[PDB]
Amino acid sequence: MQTLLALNWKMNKTPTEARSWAEELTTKYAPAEGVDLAVLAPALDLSALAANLPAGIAFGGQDVSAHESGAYTGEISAAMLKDAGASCVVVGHSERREYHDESDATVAAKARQAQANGLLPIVCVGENLDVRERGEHVPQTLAQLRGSLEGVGADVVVAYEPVWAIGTGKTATADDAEELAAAIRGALREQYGARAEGIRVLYGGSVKPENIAEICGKPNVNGALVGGASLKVPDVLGMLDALR
Amino acid sequence: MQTLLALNWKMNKTPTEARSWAEELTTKYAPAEGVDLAVLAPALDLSALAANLPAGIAFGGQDVSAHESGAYTGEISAAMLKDAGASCVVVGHSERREYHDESDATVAAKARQAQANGLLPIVCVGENLDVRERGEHVPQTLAQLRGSLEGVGADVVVAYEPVWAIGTGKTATADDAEELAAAIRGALREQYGARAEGIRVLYGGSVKPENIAEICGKPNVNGALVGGASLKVPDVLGMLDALR
Ligand SMILES: [Ca+2]
Ligand SMILES: [Ca+2]
Ligand SMILES: [Ca+2]
């Protein structure tokens, strides 16, 4: 299992800033065996990343259309991402489920578009504070996972991001991460059988250089989906160190 | 003023295809007197267009975030579009009002982000079949316009696209396009005074080489927002001929 350090810039960096960032990462990047990096950027930054990122650092999108092509003004397809050199894409991020009303079935459809076009979808699931306060975070997140992976093949990454951990500074405990990661792997076995052992399950939500080692060190956590700490190369370099 | 031939590819063309299209257009394009072109593309195609479009052809986006920057996964900002070379952007397209639940107030916010970053917003308005059959197309479209231009400066383009004309083949008559353009201009004078006379008002919805001249020749129509006919260079060249 390759540990995966996925870097979600969200809506940050112009193409000019993406090029400088990737130039800076290039000067400072030393591969860690066992660890893949992926930079998930705004779609118009992908050209800069393809030109300026180091060899083995993958890059990808933050969303993708549910449709193959057509009269969907403002949407960007899996064929387009792929052609730009993307190898992965985030689907069903909490910010899109909330702000853009993406349903589980929409997420499944988006993941299926990714897979039809040679992209690795990173499928996000996770509960809100109210669900967590009820103690129902596992069964709700697994229900959300079944919906979101309906028709989705085994070439997928699952990212558990509790919504109360996103942008709040309230990182999940490593124990809480492993709780969901373990339950997620059980569900993946039901759906995918033996392939489940190879499916990467990430943790995301206020991940930082100082907490990432302990979270990813747990048995069923295979890496991280990183928000704010992805924006500065030194932070990236620290997180990478923690996973070496 | 200048007739504007605004070409909305919607969700079509990979960066490779965009490049090929701009190259073909470069070899075949002969400017028409008083006709400006703008190409409205998927955001990851902008780089291809910047490098390969011929002289005097603007390019721009199909949507823009209501926010400046931050934790909005999958969204693209006005500052990003500007940095990529965009000089304009579609906001409030019917497909986004319908598929992405964009309100008038959201469109107005998007338009303001555009203007704050040196982009010309193209604000779309237009009624559905139901409203048209009640004969209330003018008052409802003008109510939509007021809301979508709330706090928007006079450096704006208004595109009237009746929803029943989009992708259906059912082009408005030139007379019906002028009815809305003339009413829209009356509202623009209330909001913007003398500046209203220079605000470009476009018709869109099933525009073709065969119908574009009679529409664009109307007193208050200053160009077209073109969907399907924008995808093949030969169709662009025929629309251009019709405006010569
Ligand atoms: Ca582990
Ligand atoms: Ca994230
Ligand atoms: Ca259009």
Coordinates of all heavy atoms in Angstrom, one line a residue, chain A residues 14-89:
Chain A
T14 N -3.6 31.5 -8.3 CA -3.7 31.8 -9.8 C -2.7 30.9 -10.5 O -1.9 30.3 -9.8 CB -3.3 33.2 -10.1 OG1 -2.0 33.3 -9.7 CG2 -4.2 34.2 -9.3
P15 N -2.8 30.8 -11.8 CA -1.8 30.0 -12.5 C -0.4 30.5 -12.3 O 0.5 29.7 -12.2 CB -2.2 30.2 -14.0 CG -3.7 30.4 -13.9 CD -3.9 31.2 -12.7
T16 N -0.2 31.8 -12.1 CA 1.2 32.3 -11.8 C 1.6 31.8 -10.5 O 2.8 31.3 -10.3 CB 1.1 33.8 -11.8 OG1 0.8 34.2 -13.2 CG2 2.5 34.4 -11.4
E17 N 0.8 31.8 -9.4 CA 1.2 31.3 -8.1 C 1.4 29.8 -8.1 O 2.2 29.3 -7.4 CB 0.1 31.7 -7.0 CG -0.1 33.3 -7.0 CD -1.3 33.7 -6.1 OE1 -2.4 33.2 -6.3 OE2 -1.0 34.5 -5.1
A18 N 0.6 29.1 -9.0 CA 0.8 27.6 -9.0 C 2.2 27.3 -9.6 O 2.8 26.4 -9.1 CB -0.3 27.0 -9.9
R19 N 2.6 28.1 -10.5 CA 3.9 27.8 -11.2 C 5.1 28.0 -10.2 O 5.9 27.2 -10.0 CB 4.0 28.6 -12.5 CG 5.3 28.5 -13.2 CD 5.5 29.5 -14.3 NE 6.6 30.4 -13.9 CZ 7.4 31.0 -14.7 NH1 7.3 30.9 -16.0 NH2 8.4 31.8 -14.2
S20 N 5.0 29.2 -9.5 CA 6.0 29.5 -8.4 C 6.0 28.4 -7.3 O 7.1 28.1 -6.8 CB 5.7 30.8 -7.8 OG 5.6 31.8 -8.8
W21 N 4.8 28.0 -6.9 CA 4.7 27.0 -5.9 C 5.4 25.7 -6.3 O 6.1 25.0 -5.6 CB 3.2 26.7 -5.5 CG 2.9 25.9 -4.3 CD1 2.6 26.3 -3.1 CD2 2.8 24.4 -4.3 NE1 2.3 25.2 -2.3 CE2 2.4 24.0 -3.0 CE3 2.9 23.4 -5.3 CZ2 2.2 22.7 -2.7 CZ3 2.7 22.1 -5.0 CH2 2.3 21.8 -3.6
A22 N 5.1 25.3 -7.6 CA 5.6 24.0 -8.1 C 7.1 24.2 -8.3 O 7.8 23.2 -8.2 CB 4.9 23.7 -9.3
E23 N 7.5 25.3 -8.8 CA 9.0 25.6 -8.9 C 9.6 25.4 -7.5 O 10.7 24.8 -7.4 CB 9.3 27.0 -9.5 CG 9.0 27.0 -11.0 CD 9.1 28.5 -11.5 OE1 9.0 29.4 -10.7 OE2 9.2 28.6 -12.7
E24 N 9.1 26.0 -6.5 CA 9.6 25.9 -5.1 C 9.6 24.5 -4.6 O 10.6 24.0 -4.1 CB 8.8 26.8 -4.2 CG 9.0 26.6 -2.7 CD 10.1 27.5 -2.1 OE1 11.2 27.5 -2.5 OE2 9.7 28.2 -1.1
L25 N 8.5 23.7 -4.8 CA 8.4 22.3 -4.4 C 9.5 21.5 -5.1 O 10.1 20.6 -4.5 CB 7.1 21.7 -4.8 CG 6.9 20.2 -4.4 CD1 7.1 20.0 -2.9 CD2 5.5 19.7 -4.7
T26 N 9.7 21.8 -6.4 CA 10.8 21.1 -7.2 C 12.2 21.3 -6.5 O 12.9 20.3 -6.5 CB 10.9 21.7 -8.6 OG1 9.7 21.4 -9.3 CG2 12.1 21.1 -9.4
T27 N 12.5 22.5 -6.0 CA 13.8 22.7 -5.5 C 14.0 21.9 -4.2 O 15.0 21.4 -3.8 CB 14.2 24.1 -5.2 OG1 13.3 24.6 -4.2 CG2 14.0 25.0 -6.4
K28 N 12.8 21.7 -3.5 CA 12.9 21.2 -2.2 C 12.4 19.7 -2.0 O 12.4 19.1 -0.9 CB 12.2 22.1 -1.2 CG 13.1 23.3 -0.9 CD 12.5 24.2 0.1 CE 13.5 25.4 0.4 NZ 14.7 24.9 1.2
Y29 N 12.0 19.1 -3.1 CA 11.3 17.8 -3.0 C 12.3 16.7 -3.1 O 13.1 16.6 -4.0 CB 10.3 17.6 -4.1 CG 9.6 16.3 -4.2 CD1 8.9 15.8 -3.1 CD2 9.7 15.5 -5.3 CE1 8.3 14.5 -3.1 CE2 9.1 14.2 -5.4 CZ 8.4 13.7 -4.3 OH 7.8 12.5 -4.3
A30 N 12.3 15.9 -2.0 CA 13.0 14.6 -2.0 C 12.1 13.4 -1.7 O 11.5 13.4 -0.6 CB 14.1 14.7 -1.0
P31 N 11.9 12.5 -2.6 CA 11.0 11.4 -2.5 C 11.1 10.6 -1.2 O 12.2 10.4 -0.8 CB 11.3 10.6 -3.7 CG 11.7 11.6 -4.8 CD 12.5 12.6 -4.0
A32 N 10.0 10.2 -0.7 CA 10.0 9.3 0.5 C 9.4 8.0 0.0 O 8.3 7.9 -0.5 CB 9.1 9.9 1.6
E33 N 10.2 6.9 0.2 CA 9.7 5.6 -0.3 C 8.5 5.3 0.5 O 8.4 5.5 1.7 CB 10.8 4.5 -0.3 CG 11.1 3.9 1.0 CD 12.0 2.6 0.8 OE1 13.2 2.8 0.5 OE2 11.4 1.5 0.8
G34 N 7.5 4.8 -0.3 CA 6.2 4.5 0.3 C 5.2 5.6 0.3 O 4.0 5.4 0.7
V35 N 5.5 6.8 -0.2 CA 4.6 7.9 -0.2 C 4.4 8.6 -1.6 O 5.4 9.0 -2.2 CB 5.1 9.0 0.8 CG1 4.0 10.1 1.0 CG2 5.4 8.4 2.1
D36 N 3.2 8.6 -2.0 CA 2.8 9.4 -3.2 C 2.2 10.8 -2.8 O 1.4 10.8 -1.9 CB 1.8 8.7 -4.1 CG 2.2 7.3 -4.5 OD1 3.5 7.1 -4.5 OD2 1.4 6.4 -4.7
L37 N 2.5 11.8 -3.6 CA 1.9 13.1 -3.4 C 1.0 13.4 -4.6 O 1.3 13.0 -5.7 CB 2.9 14.2 -3.4 CG 3.4 14.6 -2.0 CD1 4.2 13.5 -1.3 CD2 4.2 15.9 -2.1
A38 N -0.1 14.0 -4.3 CA -1.0 14.5 -5.4 C -1.5 15.9 -5.0 O -1.9 16.1 -3.9 CB -2.2 13.5 -5.5
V39 N -1.4 16.8 -6.0 CA -1.8 18.1 -5.8 C -3.2 18.3 -6.5 O -3.3 18.1 -7.8 CB -0.8 19.1 -6.4 CG1 -1.2 20.5 -6.1 CG2 0.6 18.9 -5.9
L40 N -4.2 18.7 -5.8 CA -5.5 18.9 -6.3 C -5.8 20.4 -6.4 O -5.9 21.1 -5.3 CB -6.5 18.2 -5.4 CG -6.0 16.7 -5.3 CD1 -6.3 16.1 -3.9 CD2 -6.6 15.9 -6.4
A41 N -5.8 20.9 -7.6 CA -5.8 22.3 -7.8 C -7.0 22.7 -8.7 O -7.7 21.9 -9.3 CB -4.5 22.7 -8.5
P42 N -7.3 24.0 -8.7 CA -8.2 24.7 -9.6 C -7.9 24.3 -11.0 O -6.7 24.2 -11.4 CB -8.0 26.2 -9.3 CG -7.5 26.3 -8.0 CD -6.7 25.0 -7.8
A43 N -8.9 24.1 -11.8 CA -8.7 23.4 -13.1 C -7.8 24.2 -14.0 O -7.0 23.6 -14.8 CB -10.0 23.1 -13.8
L44 N -7.8 25.5 -14.0 CA -7.0 26.4 -14.8 C -5.6 26.5 -14.3 O -4.8 27.2 -14.9 CB -7.6 27.8 -15.0 CG -8.2 28.5 -13.8 CD1 -7.2 28.6 -12.6 CD2 -8.5 29.9 -14.3
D45 N -5.2 25.8 -13.2 CA -3.8 25.7 -12.8 C -3.1 24.4 -13.2 O -2.0 24.3 -12.9 CB -3.8 25.8 -11.2 CG -4.1 27.1 -10.7 OD1 -4.3 28.1 -11.4 OD2 -4.2 27.2 -9.4
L46 N -3.9 23.5 -13.8 CA -3.4 22.2 -14.2 C -2.2 22.3 -15.2 O -1.3 21.5 -15.1 CB -4.5 21.3 -14.7 CG -5.6 21.0 -13.7 CD1 -6.7 20.1 -14.4 CD2 -5.1 20.3 -12.5
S47 N -2.4 23.2 -16.1 CA -1.3 23.4 -17.2 C 0.0 23.8 -16.5 O 1.1 23.3 -16.8 CB -1.8 24.4 -18.2 OG -0.8 24.6 -19.1
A48 N 0.0 24.7 -15.6 CA 1.2 25.1 -14.8 C 1.7 23.9 -14.1 O 2.9 23.7 -14.0 CB 0.8 26.3 -13.9
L49 N 0.9 23.1 -13.4 CA 1.4 22.0 -12.7 C 2.0 20.9 -13.6 O 3.0 20.4 -13.2 CB 0.3 21.4 -11.8 CG -0.2 22.2 -10.7 CD1 -1.4 21.6 -9.9 CD2 0.9 22.6 -9.7
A50 N 1.5 20.7 -14.8 CA 2.0 19.7 -15.6 C 3.4 20.1 -16.1 O 4.3 19.3 -16.2 CB 1.1 19.4 -16.8
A51 N 3.6 21.4 -16.3 CA 4.9 21.9 -16.7 C 5.9 22.0 -15.6 O 7.1 21.8 -15.9 CB 4.7 23.3 -17.3
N52 N 5.5 22.2 -14.4 CA 6.5 22.6 -13.3 C 6.6 21.7 -12.1 O 7.5 21.8 -11.3 CB 6.1 24.0 -12.8 CG 6.3 25.0 -13.9 OD1 5.3 25.5 -14.5 ND2 7.5 25.4 -14.1
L53 N 5.7 20.7 -12.0 CA 5.8 19.7 -10.9 C 6.9 18.7 -11.2 O 7.1 18.3 -12.3 CB 4.5 19.0 -10.6 CG 3.4 19.7 -9.8 CD1 2.3 18.7 -9.6 CD2 4.0 20.1 -8.4
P54 N 7.5 18.2 -10.1 CA 8.4 17.0 -10.2 C 7.8 15.8 -10.7 O 6.6 15.6 -10.6 CB 8.9 16.8 -8.7 CG 8.7 18.1 -8.1 CD 7.5 18.7 -8.7
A55 N 8.6 14.9 -11.2 CA 8.2 13.7 -11.9 C 7.1 12.9 -11.3 O 6.0 12.7 -12.0 CB 9.4 12.8 -12.1
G56 N 7.2 12.5 -10.1 CA 6.4 11.5 -9.5 C 5.3 12.1 -8.7 O 4.7 11.4 -7.9
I57 N 5.1 13.4 -8.8 CA 4.0 14.0 -8.1 C 2.8 14.2 -9.0 O 2.8 14.8 -10.0 CB 4.4 15.4 -7.6 CG1 5.5 15.2 -6.6 CG2 3.2 16.1 -6.9 CD1 6.1 16.5 -6.0
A58 N 1.7 13.5 -8.6 CA 0.5 13.5 -9.5 C -0.3 14.8 -9.2 O 0.0 15.5 -8.2 CB -0.3 12.3 -9.1
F59 N -1.1 15.2 -10.1 CA -2.0 16.3 -10.0 C -3.3 16.0 -10.5 O -3.5 15.1 -11.3 CB -1.3 17.6 -10.6 CG -1.0 17.4 -12.0 CD1 -1.9 17.9 -13.0 CD2 0.2 16.9 -12.4 CE1 -1.6 17.7 -14.3 CE2 0.5 16.8 -13.7 CZ -0.4 17.2 -14.7
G60 N -4.3 16.8 -10.1 CA -5.7 16.5 -10.4 C -6.7 17.6 -10.1 O -6.2 18.7 -9.6
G61 N -7.9 17.3 -10.3 CA -9.0 18.3 -10.1 C -9.6 18.2 -8.7 O -9.4 17.3 -7.9
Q62 N -10.5 19.2 -8.4 CA -11.2 19.4 -7.2 C -12.7 19.0 -7.4 O -13.4 19.0 -6.4 CB -11.1 20.8 -6.7 CG -9.7 21.1 -6.1 CD -9.6 22.5 -5.7 OE1 -10.5 23.2 -5.7 NE2 -8.3 22.9 -5.5
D63 N -13.1 18.8 -8.6 CA -14.5 18.4 -9.0 C -14.5 18.0 -10.4 O -13.5 18.2 -11.1 CB -15.4 19.6 -8.7 CG -16.9 19.3 -9.0 OD1 -17.3 18.1 -8.7 OD2 -17.6 20.2 -9.4
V64 N -15.6 17.4 -10.9 CA -15.8 17.0 -12.3 C -17.3 16.9 -12.5 O -18.0 16.5 -11.7 CB -15.0 15.7 -12.6 CG1 -15.7 14.5 -11.9 CG2 -14.9 15.4 -14.1
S65 N -17.7 17.1 -13.8 CA -19.1 17.0 -14.2 C -19.6 15.6 -14.0 O -18.8 14.6 -14.2 CB -19.2 17.5 -15.6 OG -20.6 17.4 -16.0
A66 N -20.9 15.5 -13.8 CA -21.5 14.2 -13.9 C -21.8 13.8 -15.3 O -22.1 12.6 -15.6 CB -22.9 14.3 -13.1
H67 N -21.6 14.7 -16.3 CA -21.9 14.4 -17.7 C -20.6 14.3 -18.5 O -19.6 14.8 -18.1 CB -22.8 15.6 -18.3 CG -24.0 15.9 -17.4 ND1 -25.1 15.2 -17.5 CD2 -24.2 16.9 -16.5 CE1 -26.0 15.7 -16.6 NE2 -25.4 16.7 -16.0
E68 N -20.8 13.6 -19.6 CA -19.6 13.4 -20.5 C -19.2 14.7 -21.3 O -18.0 14.9 -21.4 CB -19.9 12.3 -21.4 CG -18.8 12.0 -22.4 CD -18.9 10.6 -23.0 OE1 -19.9 10.3 -23.7 OE2 -18.0 9.8 -22.6
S69 N -20.2 15.3 -21.8 CA -20.0 16.6 -22.5 C -21.3 17.2 -22.8 O -22.4 16.6 -22.5 CB -19.3 16.3 -23.9 OG -20.2 15.6 -24.7
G70 N -21.4 18.4 -23.3 CA -22.6 19.1 -23.6 C -23.0 20.4 -23.0 O -22.1 21.2 -22.6
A71 N -24.3 20.7 -23.0 CA -24.8 22.0 -22.7 C -24.9 22.2 -21.2 O -26.0 22.3 -20.6 CB -26.2 22.2 -23.4
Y72 N -23.7 22.2 -20.5 CA -23.6 22.4 -19.1 C -22.7 23.5 -18.8 O -21.5 23.3 -18.4 CB -23.1 21.1 -18.4 CG -24.0 19.9 -18.9 CD1 -23.6 19.0 -19.8 CD2 -25.3 19.8 -18.3 CE1 -24.4 18.0 -20.3 CE2 -26.2 18.7 -18.8 CZ -25.7 17.8 -19.7 OH -26.5 16.8 -20.1
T73 N -23.1 24.8 -19.0 CA -22.3 25.9 -18.9 C -21.5 26.0 -17.6 O -22.1 25.8 -16.5 CB -23.0 27.3 -19.2 OG1 -23.6 27.2 -20.5 CG2 -22.1 28.5 -19.0
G74 N -20.2 26.2 -17.6 CA -19.4 26.3 -16.5 C -18.9 25.0 -15.9 O -18.0 25.0 -15.0
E75 N -19.4 23.9 -16.4 CA -18.8 22.6 -15.9 C -17.6 22.1 -16.7 O -17.4 22.5 -17.9 CB -20.0 21.5 -15.9 CG -21.2 22.0 -15.1 CD -22.2 20.9 -14.9 OE1 -21.8 19.7 -15.0 OE2 -23.5 21.2 -14.7
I76 N -16.8 21.2 -16.1 CA -15.6 20.7 -16.7 C -15.6 19.2 -16.6 O -15.9 18.6 -15.5 CB -14.3 21.3 -15.9 CG1 -14.3 22.8 -16.1 CG2 -13.0 20.6 -16.4 CD1 -13.1 23.4 -15.3
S77 N -15.4 18.5 -17.7 CA -15.5 17.1 -17.8 C -14.3 16.3 -17.4 O -13.2 16.8 -17.4 CB -16.0 16.7 -19.2 OG -14.8 16.8 -20.0
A78 N -14.5 15.0 -17.2 CA -13.4 14.0 -16.9 C -12.5 13.9 -18.1 O -11.3 13.8 -17.9 CB -14.0 12.7 -16.5
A79 N -13.1 14.0 -19.3 CA -12.2 13.9 -20.5 C -11.3 15.1 -20.6 O -10.1 15.0 -20.9 CB -13.1 13.9 -21.8
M80 N -11.8 16.3 -20.2 CA -11.0 17.5 -20.1 C -9.9 17.5 -19.1 O -8.7 17.8 -19.4 CB -11.8 18.8 -19.8 CG -12.9 19.1 -20.9 SD -14.0 20.3 -20.4 CE -15.1 20.4 -21.8
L81 N -10.2 17.0 -17.9 CA -9.2 16.9 -16.9 C -8.0 15.9 -17.3 O -6.9 16.2 -17.2 CB -9.8 16.3 -15.6 CG -10.8 17.3 -14.9 CD1 -11.4 16.6 -13.7 CD2 -10.0 18.5 -14.5
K82 N -8.5 14.8 -17.8 CA -7.5 13.8 -18.3 C -6.6 14.3 -19.3 O -5.4 14.1 -19.3 CB -8.3 12.6 -18.8 CG -7.4 11.4 -19.3 CD -6.7 10.8 -18.1 CE -5.8 9.6 -18.6 NZ -5.2 8.8 -17.5
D83 N -7.1 15.1 -20.2 CA -6.4 15.6 -21.4 C -5.4 16.6 -20.9 O -4.3 16.8 -21.5 CB -7.2 16.2 -22.4 CG -6.4 16.7 -23.6 OD1 -5.9 15.9 -24.4 OD2 -6.2 17.9 -23.8
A84 N -5.7 17.3 -19.8 CA -4.8 18.3 -19.2 C -3.7 17.6 -18.4 O -2.8 18.3 -17.8 CB -5.6 19.2 -18.3
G85 N -3.8 16.3 -18.2 CA -2.7 15.5 -17.5 C -3.1 15.2 -16.1 O -2.2 14.7 -15.4
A86 N -4.3 15.5 -15.6 CA -4.8 14.9 -14.4 C -4.8 13.4 -14.3 O -5.0 12.8 -15.3 CB -6.2 15.4 -14.1
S87 N -4.5 12.9 -13.1 CA -4.6 11.5 -12.9 C -5.6 11.1 -11.8 O -5.8 9.9 -11.5 CB -3.2 10.9 -12.6 OG -2.6 11.5 -11.6
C88 N -6.1 12.1 -11.1 CA -7.1 11.9 -10.0 C -8.0 13.1 -9.9 O -7.8 14.2 -10.5 CB -6.3 11.8 -8.7 SG -5.1 13.1 -8.4
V89 N -9.1 13.0 -9.1 CA -10.0 14.1 -8.9 C -10.8 13.9 -7.6 O -11.3 12.8 -7.3 CB -10.9 14.4 -10.1 CG1 -11.9 13.1 -10.4 CG2 -11.8 15.6 -9.9

